[PDB]
Amino acid sequence: RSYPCDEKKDSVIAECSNRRLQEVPQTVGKYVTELDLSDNFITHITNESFQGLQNLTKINLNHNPNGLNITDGAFLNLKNLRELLLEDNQLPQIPSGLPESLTELSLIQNNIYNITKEGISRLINLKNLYLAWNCYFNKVCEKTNIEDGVFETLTNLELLSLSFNSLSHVPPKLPSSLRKLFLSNTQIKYISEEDFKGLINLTLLDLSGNCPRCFNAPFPCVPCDGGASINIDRFAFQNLTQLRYLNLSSTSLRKINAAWFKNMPHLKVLDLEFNYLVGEIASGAFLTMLPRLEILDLSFNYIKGSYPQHINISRNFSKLLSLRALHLRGYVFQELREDDFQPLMQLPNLSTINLGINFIKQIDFKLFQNFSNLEIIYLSENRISPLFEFDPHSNFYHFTRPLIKPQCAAYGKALDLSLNSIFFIGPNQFENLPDIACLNLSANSNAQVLSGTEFSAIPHVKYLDLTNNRLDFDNASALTELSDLEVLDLSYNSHYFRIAGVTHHLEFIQNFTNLKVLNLSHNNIYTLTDKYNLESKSLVELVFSGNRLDILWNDDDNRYISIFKGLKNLTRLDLSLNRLKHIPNEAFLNLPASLTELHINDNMLKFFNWTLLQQFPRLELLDLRGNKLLFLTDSLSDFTSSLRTLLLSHNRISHLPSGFLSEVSSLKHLDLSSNLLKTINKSALETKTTTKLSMLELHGNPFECTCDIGDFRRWMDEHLNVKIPRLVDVICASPGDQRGKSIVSLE
Amino acid sequence: RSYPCDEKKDSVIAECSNRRLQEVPQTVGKYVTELDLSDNFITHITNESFQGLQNLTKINLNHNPNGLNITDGAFLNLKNLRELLLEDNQLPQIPSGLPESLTELSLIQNNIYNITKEGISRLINLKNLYLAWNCYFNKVCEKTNIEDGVFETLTNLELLSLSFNSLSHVPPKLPSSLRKLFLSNTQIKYISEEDFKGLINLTLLDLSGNCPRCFNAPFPCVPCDGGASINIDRFAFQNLTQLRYLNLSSTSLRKINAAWFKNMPHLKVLDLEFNYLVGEIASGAFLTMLPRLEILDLSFNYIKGSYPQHINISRNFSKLLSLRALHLRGYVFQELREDDFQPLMQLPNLSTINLGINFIKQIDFKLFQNFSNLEIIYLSENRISPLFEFDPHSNFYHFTRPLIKPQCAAYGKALDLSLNSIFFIGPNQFENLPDIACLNLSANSNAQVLSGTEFSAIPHVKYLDLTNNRLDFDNASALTELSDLEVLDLSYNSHYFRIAGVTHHLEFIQNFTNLKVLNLSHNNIYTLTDKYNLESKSLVELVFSGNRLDILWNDDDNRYISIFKGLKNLTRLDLSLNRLKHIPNEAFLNLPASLTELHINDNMLKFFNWTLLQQFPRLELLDLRGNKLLFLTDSLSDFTSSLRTLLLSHNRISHLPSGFLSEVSSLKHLDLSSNLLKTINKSALETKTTTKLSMLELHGNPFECTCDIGDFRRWMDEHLNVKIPRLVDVICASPGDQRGKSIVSLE
Ligand SMILES: *[C@@H]1O[C@H](CO)[C@@H](O[C@@H]2O[C@H](CO)[C@@H](O[C@@H]3O[C@H](CO)[C@@H](O)[C@H](O)[C@@H]3O)[C@H](O)[C@H]2NC(C)=O)[C@H](O)[C@H]1NC(C)=O
Ligand SMILES: *[C@@H]1O[C@H](CO)[C@@H](O[C@@H]2O[C@H](CO)[C@@H](O[C@@H]3O[C@H](CO)[C@@H](O)[C@H](O)[C@@H]3O)[C@H](O)[C@H]2NC(C)=O)[C@H](O)[C@H]1NC(C)=O
Ligand SMILES: *[C@@H]1O[C@H](CO)[C@@H](O[C@@H]2O[C@H](CO)[C@@H](O[C@@H]3O[C@H](CO)[C@@H](O)[C@H](O)[C@@H]3O)[C@H](O)[C@H]2NC(C)=O)[C@H](O)[C@H]1NC(C)=O
Ligand SMILES: *[C@@H]1O[C@H](CO)[C@@H](O[C@@H]2O[C@H](CO)[C@@H](O[C@@H]3O[C@H](CO)[C@@H](O)[C@H](O)[C@@H]3O)[C@H](O)[C@H]2NC(C)=O)[C@H](O)[C@H]1NC(C)=O
Ligand SMILES: CCCCc1cc2c(o1)c(N)nc1ccccc12
Ligand SMILES: CCCCc1cc2c(o1)c(N)nc1ccccc12
Ligand SMILES: *[C@@H]1O[C@H](CO)[C@@H](O)[C@H](O)[C@H]1NC(C)=O
Ligand SMILES: *[C@@H]1O[C@H](CO)[C@@H](O)[C@H](O)[C@H]1NC(C)=O
Ligand SMILES: *[C@@H]1O[C@H](CO)[C@@H](O)[C@H](O)[C@H]1NC(C)=O
Ligand SMILES: *[C@@H]1O[C@H](CO)[C@@H](O)[C@H](O)[C@H]1NC(C)=O
Ligand SMILES: *[C@@H]1O[C@H](CO)[C@@H](O)[C@H](O)[C@H]1NC(C)=O
Ligand SMILES: *[C@@H]1O[C@H](CO)[C@@H](O)[C@H](O)[C@H]1NC(C)=O
Ligand SMILES: *[C@@H]1O[C@H](CO)[C@@H](O)[C@H](O)[C@H]1NC(C)=O
Ligand SMILES: *[C@@H]1O[C@H](CO)[C@@H](O)[C@H](O)[C@H]1NC(C)=O
Ligand SMILES: *[C@@H]1O[C@H](CO)[C@@H](O)[C@H](O)[C@H]1NC(C)=O
Ligand SMILES: *[C@@H]1O[C@H](CO)[C@@H](O)[C@H](O)[C@H]1NC(C)=O
Ligand SMILES: *[C@@H]1O[C@H](CO)[C@@H](O)[C@H](O)[C@H]1NC(C)=O
Ligand SMILES: *[C@@H]1O[C@H](CO)[C@@H](O)[C@H](O)[C@H]1NC(C)=O
Ligand SMILES: *[C@@H]1O[C@H](CO)[C@@H](O)[C@H](O)[C@H]1NC(C)=O
Ligand SMILES: *[C@@H]1O[C@H](CO)[C@@H](O)[C@H](O)[C@H]1NC(C)=O
Ligand SMILES: *[C@@H]1O[C@H](CO)[C@@H](O)[C@H](O)[C@H]1NC(C)=O
Ligand SMILES: *[C@@H]1O[C@H](CO)[C@@H](O)[C@H](O)[C@H]1NC(C)=O
Ligand SMILES: *[C@@H]1O[C@H](CO)[C@@H](O)[C@H](O)[C@H]1NC(C)=O
Ligand SMILES: *[C@@H]1O[C@H](CO)[C@@H](O)[C@H](O)[C@H]1NC(C)=O
């Protein structure tokens, strides 16, 4: 049994990260090809650390310890080591005597201020070299010395990242093999005609954050004198004929030279965020030179102190024939009129329009249907009313998550109006819109009494997000015009639900013949009007977490005893976070017999009636994590032949009954972590049959490592293929001389 | 080392199929959850076959042997057996005493004519039961007796397949749990009001092939008397409110009762192929009752002997608001005019139109751009000119592969004009078309001299399929108007290439700045005009199989010695099937130094100069399978530190040199199957280092199983994680007493 790592198997990974290791383990399998030792407490690497492990092609030593001392030549023996990750190790230098086999080396987030021939010029197979984020913001550090011609040797180098270092000039003598060159936030003020003249293979150039626009910066930001623009020679990009990505965000551009793009016939992504380009947006010649451009980001180009009535888009936007996505967040303007987006309306592939964070107060919605074919109309975070801190592997200037959840966007055209002030829905709000399938009205503080007409103009919504509002369910016909609805999210509408004296009608749920997923979480539901039962022939999943089943199922009240029984198709039910101390037997018995997955985690349960599992013959997963359960039934084998996964972590169990690990015929995964087990008896292991488990989780119990643990230790050896994860965290609490050892120590 | 099965690891599969096993192996790992024993020579199953293997949830015994004798209660001990596959085993009955744990049982393609309570009524957890294809066509077999109420017990049954059995009537007493009911080709002539009256959960109903349309059938086909229609009671489908799929193909329908669909508000797929519905296509009321229908298949509804001028589509097609795909193959008509498809033109989601196999002679192509948004215009196999045999798990009436290759369709709008008679391209052929990205002109016997203007009206093609034509490359500007082209398929244009006295100009390949993949296979290329070199800065993959490099690289001719050198970006090169007996050193040396993958398989090579691998430092895969190589270099370790996979199966190698399995630092996968190895020496195994292999293939060598094989056998035990597949086929050829044993036998 592999220790302290967990092995996964076109290569074999030893997962050994975040395990408190104070040394490289000397027990790595000889068949391992990738070794992850990140996030431990390792302080020395030498030539003995990985002795003879010639199958290792990748080693991850990021974030050690929690500086890392690597001797000269420590890795030199590894003849096929290709990838070495040494991020966030407080290194003062590039380690010497690295193996010539390397194709990827990462030294991100260290204290390296000297890039030398001695450290890298021998690494002639290098393909990707990451040196970003060694000297930046208000760190105490030195300007980076790049030894003249250090990279010139590296004739296979395709990616070089030097961002977030103090460089002052583009390094000379770069190899023409480069494809991707990242020089963001390097304090370069001037790009010469010579800087990139031989980089005829380059596909990506990142010059962002040189002469930055520092107003309202979320980091320590140092502008060029006067807040001046980066200075880019007219001929700087003359031979960059392979460029697809160009990042000039936060370079304090006021002017774009259209002829910069004369010899980039492939440019596909242009990032121009956080500049001063309102004037170029209105009249820019560069827009005519980009007929293959797919993504244009012009976000945060606002004029400080200016709140113009309208956005001013050049007619030359009509020449962006391949455009797919246009991001215009943070331009800052009051009203969007149809005439204002005329230049975009014939572009055949413009599918995403992003107008987030513009403080727009009014939109002429009819305009969107006159575009050729929008699929994402993203208007989140405006003012519409009724009609180390930075991840070095992510984008610095924006989030990269999808604008609209993929599960909602998969249904078809999407309109996102979240985080505005559309506090009620008037009879004309959705007039003249495309056939919207995905609608987001989250966080509009909406208090509407939905009554069956409000979405009549967009009646084919399939995924509706009404979260974080204050909906008032006073009318049983709410939402019944949406006949095709499949997903409804009503999470965080507690406002009226918490008030006993107003009405709460959830009758409408029965009207949907296509509804599959319903989220009622965090509504503080404790009382309903007239009809006490939820009913649906179609619903498969109900999330009811964060409500008050403790009240609904109070022992003095019989009204809600079948609240979910009428969800005749239900397979997944989440009752977590409902303050439950015990469930009435009759209420448990009235849960739908169709259930396969039942979550009751994070309640306060001291009692569970196991016998009632006899009435759920399709139940595969039962989650009771995070409760106060003091004991387990001794008869689970009599109550289920379907249960596959039983999650019981974070309870107060101190004894495992006879047969618990063997007798349930279908049980594969049993999580008993973070309970109060001191031992596991022989009788628990085996009765008439032998275990069918494939995973048993036990970390965080106070095991007693006397000879009384001997039967379980022998059982572990007889049953190697029962995975017990985190053996390093399956720790003797006693006796004193064994405290802190994994139970897997001692004999 | 697991034998005779190969183990793969949320479950562990023992792959044990097609290994000539004459008995269930008694060596299955106790941790195995799915056991595949299909396609062996097993003839008996008893209660000893799977004794104690309580982790088995799935067993596949299909196609044994190559009848299978299963004793009463043989599987009864397995308490969690869920899936049992027993297809094509010549069973005369349902096995008795099957385990109550079963949720899936397949008895497809047996000799079972009796469905009895004794066999199935105890299986109350069954969810899917397959009994199809036990009595059909001209098999000698009996009508199926279904014991009254046999399925009524099965209150969890969701899928029941009885197709291709002689049933005569729908069985009574079906459980209302059913979701999918397949009764294709069951000789049922009449559907009563009672037949499906309680099936309120049904989503799929398959009644195809009852009262079949037998003209030109590719199987023995028995029509209803007179060729009459199936007889479906008006109220037959009255309660099938959950139906999404309805298959009435080949039921000899002339009339569709529109009110059959009155209570199917969810119907999504309607299959009506091989009927007599020309009159209903022209005027059918049913088209108004299907506003959620996505796929309509009306293929092969032609009137025998009739070749009308035009197709006649009802205006009611305009009511099919959700339609995505319309299949109208085999209607048979002469000309497609714009007025004829008016009813389809406003449907917003109609993305696929399939008019295959109509013998259409003329098309008004401008019509397609007036649809709302077609993405697949499939006109393959028409007459346009210049302007057991059946897989029981597939569809019986059509192929299910995508109409257009997904790699071509991923680029955008697709027009497939393959298998017509467009034998030259005139100046107006592609006028008035949408912006086509994927164009298929395969198999039009096209002899055009392409000259740089023929695709001017559709200049943004990205994936062009010109295979199986007779292109005449007399003009160096061919195809140069397609500036965005990324994939070009010129396979099987040997016609003019085989003629020495006509010109062959391939200069144009250099003009494409986006070209990634070029297929020149099967062109019999042996001579080019003026320029002897292929050149491209962008190309990554060239397929040159099936040409005459043997001639191009003849020792008396220096003209083609750098033919591929100018493909400066190339990583994948396929030179298979070029009749090569030896490659000139200088020609091998002139292959691009960028190569990662090089295929020279299926030539006639007796010589390979291994030393020349020193000039390919990115080479990862080398494929030399299917040649005549008599020996291997002894120095491969000196010639490469990049080679990962070396494929040498089907050559004539009889000795492995010292260090072959250990000394190449990067070599992981070595295929030496089907050579003439008698032994593997100690020195081959290990020299300064020890093996880095993770896979070694050795099946089909004539091994000598004397004590001289002892060093290799010990090495196999020391190196368990070097996978040697198919140990059953790694067979002693000698001595006589060991012949036929796996080398893994004997000590
Ligand atoms: C409707 O609009 C709301 C508000 O814009 C969307 O809420 C946002 O949803 C995203 C995506 O899930 C949340 O980001 C994620 O958060 C977690 C951190 O807890 C992280 O694991 C992910 O990496 C990701 O960043 C975001 O915080 C949340 N914003 C707010 C204010 O709640 C919602 O997704 C939209 N609905 C649809 C259907 O698109
Ligand atoms: C309200 O309840 C729904 C239903 O549970 C929540 O949406 C669901 O959120 C889960 C993630 O918690 C999604 O599952 C995940 O899907 C991703 C992408 O396929 C997968 O990679 C993950 O491993 C996991 O399976 C699930 O798809 C999603 N369902 C739908 C219909 O969107 C929703 O987030 C809840 N709302 C609030 C405000 O919490
Ligand atoms: C352009 O049109 C031609 C002719 O219609 C297409 O050729 C056809 O391609 C399909 C798909 O690959 C072939 O089917 C496949 O064949 C093999 C059997 O060898 C099988 O492995 C697959 O399961 C599949 O059935 C088909 O035989 C072939 N037809 C002919 C007459 O050659 C071609 O794919 C079209 N090109 C594009 C880009 O879509
Ligand atoms: C002419 O040469 C091209 C380039 O090799 C051939 O198309 C390629 O065919 C291979 C299959 O042999 C495709 O790879 C396969 O892709 C599928 C789907 O992703 C994957 O599941 C398989 O495991 C395998 O990777 C490859 O995608 C495809 N390339 C393109 C650009 O379509 C083409 O078939 C050849 N033409 C003739 C007539 O043989
Ligand atoms: C996103 C741009 C930062 C400068 C700015 C503009 C505005 C705000 O902040 C800001 N915080 N609120 C506003 C409210 C109405 C109109 C303009 C703004
Ligand atoms: C696909 C329909 C089978 C009956 C049929 C019609 C025709 C053929 O076969 C057939 N084989 N060739 C034809 C040529 C021109 C017009 C009609 C046909
Ligand atoms: C680094 O570790 C080595 C031993 O591996 C030790 O001799 C040396 O003192 C350490 N270096 C520093 C700067 O602490
Ligand atoms: C530049 O790219 C080409 C492919 O067109 C390639 O052959 C060349 O090796 C690259 N340049 C280098 C490695 O300097
Ligand atoms: C629009 O997108 C489609 C699908 O990706 C592509 O085929 C087409 O060439 C694009 N049109 C333009 C003008 O780029
Ligand atoms: C709609 O779009 C077209 C361009 O496709 C434009 O000419 C026209 O002015 C727009 N119509 C309206 C009403 O804005
Ligand atoms: C709900 O609102 C509708 C539309 O206003 C109204 O006609 C109906 O009477 C109300 N429904 C109730 C009270 O159930
Ligand atoms: C909602 O469903 C009930 C049947 O349970 C029906 O009485 C009611 O009319 C439906 N309401 C609407 C507006 O469809
Ligand atoms: C029950 O759920 C499944 C899965 O979503 C669905 O196929 C079926 O239509 C549902 N049943 C009903 C009556 O709506
Ligand atoms: C379990 O539930 C049933 C009532 O439904 C009862 O017979 C048995 O007493 C229960 N156990 C407990 C602890 O209430
Ligand atoms: C079932 O598999 C587990 C490993 O997942 C193994 O330890 C156990 O012995 C097996 N049980 C039986 C009865 O074979
Ligand atoms: C089937 O095999 C059993 C032994 O397992 C044997 O007794 C019996 O004769 C066989 N049945 C037939 C019909 O051959
Ligand atoms: C019919 O489907 C429903 C879901 O709406 C389900 O509750 C019921 O169990 C199914 N019918 C059966 C099992 O007979
Ligand atoms: C058309 O398809 C889209 C995307 O799948 C879907 O949102 C929409 O509802 C469909 N329109 C109709 C009329 O079915
Ligand atoms: C084009 O399509 C529309 C329906 O969208 C139809 O009314 C019109 O008649 C068609 N035009 C031509 C020229 O066929
Ligand atoms: C190829 O054809 C073009 C168009 O016909 C013609 O103008 C040109 O002269 C020819 N190109 C040659 C012979 O290279
Ligand atoms: C094709 O490429 C060559 C340069 O190698 C150039 O002479 C020729 O003009 C190009 N032809 C066309 C039609 O673009
Ligand atoms: C070489 O190939 C890669 C992968 O397709 C591509 O990124 C690059 O553009 C190519 N180089 C040239 C010069 O076209
Ligand atoms: C391998 O190639 C080179 C010539 O390029 C030569 O030195 C050596 O003789 C060659 N070996 C054979 C067998 O030709
Ligand atoms: C490398 O891994 C193989 C299994 O893939 C193993 O048999 C061999 O002993 C390993 N070699 C070394 C040097 O550890």
mmCIF file of C-alpha atoms in Angstrom, chain B residues 407-473:
data_model
loop_
_atom_site.group_PDB
_atom_site.id
_atom_site.type_symbol
_atom_site.label_atom_id
_atom_site.label_comp_id
_atom_site.label_asym_id
_atom_site.label_seq_id
_atom_site.Cartn_x
_atom_site.Cartn_y
_atom_site.Cartn_z
ATOM 1 C CA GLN B 407 -14.317 17.767 -38.700
ATOM 2 C CA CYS B 408 -15.733 19.533 -41.792
ATOM 3 C CA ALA B 409 -19.052 20.479 -40.231
ATOM 4 C CA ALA B 410 -17.285 22.113 -37.264
ATOM 5 C CA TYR B 411 -16.118 24.946 -39.576
ATOM 6 C CA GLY B 412 -19.608 26.227 -40.329
ATOM 7 C CA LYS B 413 -22.227 25.899 -43.069
ATOM 8 C CA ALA B 414 -21.865 22.717 -45.119
ATOM 9 C CA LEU B 415 -22.889 21.874 -48.688
ATOM 10 C CA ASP B 416 -22.509 18.216 -49.692
ATOM 11 C CA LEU B 417 -22.768 17.620 -53.447
ATOM 12 C CA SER B 418 -20.905 14.299 -53.458
ATOM 13 C CA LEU B 419 -21.769 11.453 -55.820
ATOM 14 C CA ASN B 420 -23.278 13.583 -58.512
ATOM 15 C CA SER B 421 -22.095 14.307 -62.095
ATOM 16 C CA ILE B 422 -20.604 17.819 -61.671
ATOM 17 C CA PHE B 423 -17.675 16.908 -63.991
ATOM 18 C CA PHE B 424 -16.416 20.423 -64.448
ATOM 19 C CA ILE B 425 -16.884 23.694 -62.565
ATOM 20 C CA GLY B 426 -18.347 26.503 -64.719
ATOM 21 C CA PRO B 427 -18.054 30.151 -63.856
ATOM 22 C CA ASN B 428 -21.525 30.378 -62.219
ATOM 23 C CA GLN B 429 -21.894 27.016 -60.460
ATOM 24 C CA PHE B 430 -21.662 28.441 -56.952
ATOM 25 C CA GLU B 431 -23.551 31.729 -57.417
ATOM 26 C CA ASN B 432 -26.157 32.805 -54.789
ATOM 27 C CA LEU B 433 -25.054 30.361 -52.068
ATOM 28 C CA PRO B 434 -24.640 31.023 -48.343
ATOM 29 C CA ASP B 435 -21.105 31.530 -46.982
ATOM 30 C CA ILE B 436 -20.162 27.897 -47.217
ATOM 31 C CA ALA B 437 -17.311 26.712 -44.902
ATOM 32 C CA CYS B 438 -17.496 22.917 -45.617
ATOM 33 C CA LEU B 439 -17.772 21.767 -49.218
ATOM 34 C CA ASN B 440 -17.952 18.164 -50.452
ATOM 35 C CA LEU B 441 -17.360 17.546 -54.134
ATOM 36 C CA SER B 442 -16.255 13.938 -53.714
ATOM 37 C CA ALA B 443 -17.039 11.476 -56.497
ATOM 38 C CA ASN B 444 -18.281 13.762 -59.201
ATOM 39 C CA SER B 445 -15.724 12.480 -61.817
ATOM 40 C CA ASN B 446 -14.583 16.058 -62.016
ATOM 41 C CA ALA B 447 -11.765 16.756 -64.556
ATOM 42 C CA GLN B 448 -11.539 20.534 -64.138
ATOM 43 C CA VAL B 449 -8.318 22.445 -64.546
ATOM 44 C CA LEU B 450 -8.677 24.431 -61.311
ATOM 45 C CA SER B 451 -7.290 27.898 -62.020
ATOM 46 C CA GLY B 452 -7.970 30.295 -59.086
ATOM 47 C CA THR B 453 -11.507 31.449 -59.954
ATOM 48 C CA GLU B 454 -13.822 28.454 -59.653
ATOM 49 C CA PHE B 455 -14.740 29.044 -55.967
ATOM 50 C CA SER B 456 -14.783 32.820 -56.104
ATOM 51 C CA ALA B 457 -18.478 32.992 -55.148
ATOM 52 C CA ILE B 458 -17.791 30.887 -51.989
ATOM 53 C CA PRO B 459 -14.238 32.121 -51.202
ATOM 54 C CA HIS B 460 -14.282 31.292 -47.478
ATOM 55 C CA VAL B 461 -14.326 27.486 -47.710
ATOM 56 C CA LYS B 462 -12.160 26.109 -44.796
ATOM 57 C CA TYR B 463 -12.523 22.300 -45.432
ATOM 58 C CA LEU B 464 -12.653 21.172 -49.015
ATOM 59 C CA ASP B 465 -13.305 17.526 -50.034
ATOM 60 C CA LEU B 466 -12.330 16.846 -53.633
ATOM 61 C CA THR B 467 -11.728 13.174 -53.283
ATOM 62 C CA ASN B 468 -12.430 10.491 -55.874
ATOM 63 C CA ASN B 469 -12.423 12.785 -58.869
ATOM 64 C CA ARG B 470 -10.073 13.132 -61.910
ATOM 65 C CA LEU B 471 -8.659 16.626 -61.282
ATOM 66 C CA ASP B 472 -6.260 17.941 -63.925
ATOM 67 C CA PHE B 473 -3.498 20.028 -62.296
#
